[PDB]
């Protein structure tokens, strides 16, 4: 979940950047990154 994307923010110890990098990865390709969003997003 995106809350997990924030948990990985906390344990590493910014929202805009963490969302932007994943957003770029989303158009980068198919494997391991489309598959986490292609179903979570549709199921919200």
């Amino acid at each position: 979940s995106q809350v997990s994307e924030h948990s990985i923010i906390k344990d590493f110890t910014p929202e805009h950047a963490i969302h932007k990098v994943l957003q770029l990865m989303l158009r980068r390709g198919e494997i391991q990154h489309r598959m986490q969003r292609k179903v979570l997003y549709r199921l919200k």
């Binding site: 198919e30 494997i31 489309r34 598959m35 292609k38 549709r42």
Partner: protein
Amino acid sequence: TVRQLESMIRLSEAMARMHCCDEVQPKHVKEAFRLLNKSIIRVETPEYCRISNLIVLHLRKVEEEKRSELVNWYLKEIESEIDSEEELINKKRIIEKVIHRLTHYDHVLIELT
């Protein structure tokens, strides 16, 4: 395509014109269709029934809109009609093929049947 339809019309007209007819009867159309269909060749690739499996199961996964439950839900859903203890290994083998040639991430987004 539709060009095949116009080819069929031309061929039926020629078939009629061969018999010196003033109008095309359905026997001419039947011969034109038979010739046109016979000319077109099936493309043979080396078993090829597996595409039947892929289409029938991709359709179900489409209808439903993890691996653990879903894999054996597949390995029951297509077994609902014909008895065999021997086509299960076949279905799991083709499922592995499909996994490892990147047609299943459990039904990848970009794949048209």
